[PDB]
Amino acid sequence: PRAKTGVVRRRKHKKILKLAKGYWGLRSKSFRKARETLFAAGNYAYAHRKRRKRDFRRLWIVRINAACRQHGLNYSTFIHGLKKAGIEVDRKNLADLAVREPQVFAELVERAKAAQG
Amino acid sequence: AKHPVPKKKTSKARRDARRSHHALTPPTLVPCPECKAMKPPHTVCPECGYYAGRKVLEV
Amino acid sequence: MKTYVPKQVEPRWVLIDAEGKTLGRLATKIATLLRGKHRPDWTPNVAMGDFVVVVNADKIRVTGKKLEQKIYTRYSGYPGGLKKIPLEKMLATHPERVLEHAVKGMLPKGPLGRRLFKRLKVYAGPDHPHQAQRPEKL
Amino acid sequence: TRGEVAYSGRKIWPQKHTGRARHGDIGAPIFVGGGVVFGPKPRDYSYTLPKKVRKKGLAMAVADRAREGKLLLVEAFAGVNGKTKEFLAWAKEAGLDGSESVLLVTGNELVRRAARNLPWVVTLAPEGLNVYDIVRTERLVMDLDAWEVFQNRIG
């Protein structure tokens, strides 16, 4: 029996061409240029997922180091404050608190410098 | 076949961009003195076009 | 819990003196001000920063022999079109450039980097249009 | 193969400076319409399965049928004189209602003629007993003059 290519090849090409929807020029029209692009996008996403974690923390910090600079304070010290203050809270992420709950942040600033001043 | 040659196939984008000036302009027409039909200016409008100069009469 | 992101907020205006202030030291601050990194709702992708006005821009102090030794260069696309300009001449010819240039180079590069520079009105000596506010500072 | 194809053995172009690729004759498998690499040729799929194994399997195949009671020896039938309607009549009185496939093993020529055409009957001679036919058919129905031969086959 002879098993011709048949229908199989067109299908694999369709699968990838669909993942390449919206890409520029041929990168979305040619199976080859599409597959090359997907390789790229595959590693970017993966690397960028690991560094999305970075880019946010970075943001949180800048946000914080500004709200407590309003209360005369280095971010660097503020953090040391909470470290010794026992306050293992903040979770830096939770400094929308510093933006949504200013009074609640201010009180933390106090407990902050309260220890090690 | 010979010396200088294109190094890369020009994209659909860049060729059509070249065409951005290939658009046509419709003929400048004016209503005709006698006949109602439209004809281009300063030409003996093709239906008895003038008066003093022979109007290549369709009459 | 998504991180908070500010809406159109407030177009702030701030006034600075310059006279006697070093230069880079002042530039540092004016930059951080330009991109509201003092505001606790700082956002890198938006431009929610203060508009900065600066007066007495020509009485910017500066250490060492920088009046003679420090040179600003400019390359025209042409051959030998690299021009060299010393601080002295700049100040004497076009102050407010010496400081504008120190800030341009301290704002980030990009379409947003620009624009932030646009939000910076440097003037020779005192005076300027006082349409908006101007909470002067140090 | 590229040697059995119809085309000439001539080299298609010089080999250098032609600016084209690089070829010999168009009977090569790279060419459309060229020979076929490692395609099939006629071949004998048979082999000599150990006889001691053929027996065993034939035995066990019957056993398995008996072990589930789907096996049946019968005598002379009565519905002979090769006519399907006649057999079909006998079959009824015997339990075989064509609700399950039957492998009818008998030496009697006429009984086979009679059953042959039933879409639920595969009929076979006694010296023709093979295991494949046993395992396809649900019920196994032999006569005594056919159980004897099958009996002497094994052992």
Added chain:
Amino acid sequence: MEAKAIARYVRISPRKVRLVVDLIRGKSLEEARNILRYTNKRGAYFVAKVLESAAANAVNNHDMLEDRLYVKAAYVDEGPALKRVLPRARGRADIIKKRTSHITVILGEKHGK
């Protein structure tokens, strides 16, 4: 209610004729006629015929009134190309393709109150 004509397999290169068609898309059949008349392009001849056929089709087939119809939609598609050998220097031989057009003119009725 619209009316269309279609010239198929017209021996002309689409790119060429598509240029005069763009000259009349959306125009009142009255302009469309005056424009083609005085457009200096082989393409006009063919488009005129299609446009005119589409007009006739409107009146004598769909009831529309030669006085309220405009070029609603229009387009030319590429039909199968006539391949031809062009003898070339040093024995070369190229193929020019005489291309083919499928001209479509569809007519609508002007909202005329």
Added chain:
Amino acid sequence: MFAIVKTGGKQYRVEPGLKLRVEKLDAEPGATVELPVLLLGGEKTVVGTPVVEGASVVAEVLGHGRGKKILVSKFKAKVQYRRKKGHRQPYTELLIKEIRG
């Protein structure tokens, strides 16, 4: 009045009547859970150390889940190296009922 809870090495701002997704929990969709772990009171002043020893917040498991699949792929050029893996992060959906201060 809000609270700052910690479930699954992550801290969230829980309001009453709030639907929250969290790392998959060991509590069948019926059960109700207080995460005896709290970090901050909404009317403030109450913060102290890691966890406030008194407070806890009650939430009901609304059901476990599996998040939309992210395709995590790996490719090393010029070495013929490709890997494709599908991933869905199992979660649990909670409703925040009472903030026991």
Added chain:
RNA sequence: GGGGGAUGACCCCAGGCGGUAGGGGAGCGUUCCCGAUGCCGAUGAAGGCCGACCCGCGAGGGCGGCUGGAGGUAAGGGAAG
């Protein structure tokens, strides 16, 4: 790997899991054969075009809509252009 005698494909617990040349192990799909005098099919086969849905790590398998208009072929196996 060690447990809990479900003995697997279950729950525990603890560890390993970058990778070319290569070794090894499991699977997916294509054509054909047994399964077929069967089963699916005009209330629509194969193929085609969509899909934000379902299942699988993945190769893939579903399911639904449109097209198409006469074939297709389970479970379990077998052979390869």
Added chain:
RNA sequence: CAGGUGGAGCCUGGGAGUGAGGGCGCGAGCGAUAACGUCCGCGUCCGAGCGCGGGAACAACCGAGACCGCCAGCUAAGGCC
């Protein structure tokens, strides 16, 4: 003679690929106490970690061996106008 249960060791066998290495450190020869030179030795990394952080950018210098997910935390080199 002891510790050391390790993707340790040993024995018999099936399958290999490699037999073009390269940078760096240290020890020599050749060279000019030249070479991104060359030839050995002992180590290491790149090779195959052109994955991640630092070094402006940079296979082999510093940090560190990437199973998967997290809008959590501590750190390494290196840094904190």
Added chain:
RNA sequence: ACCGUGAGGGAAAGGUGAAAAGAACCCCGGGAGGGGAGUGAAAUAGAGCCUGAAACCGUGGGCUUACAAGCAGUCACGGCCCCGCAAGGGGUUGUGGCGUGCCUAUUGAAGCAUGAGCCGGCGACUCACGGUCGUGGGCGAGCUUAAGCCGUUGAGGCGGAG
């Protein structure tokens, strides 16, 4: 067919429908072609005819773009358009962060080293007979037949030379 003086080389090219019922007549046109009418279950089955993928070319619509710079993606946010009661999702992209094509060959390639215009189809670890291991079974001091002979709905058996 075509190529070659010649020996010789040597292709492409199948499919309407069940049935021509293969579209009378009318309109535009010189025709071609098309528009109605009509046939058909179907006419994007209309004879450049089954299905009709991809490259490729168009028309229309949504989003988007003229002070920004790049392996074209990716991660974030935000706008505008669409779906949905809903929360959610789909589309597009303004800004910000990150970012040196694929294959090959190499000590080392984004590499200014090889190959590739793009798409579709064809395209390369085989088979026989021996051998050597492993493995699933049969029988075990034994194991096994070859050619042939008989039989045969694709039925097996016999055959002991070796």
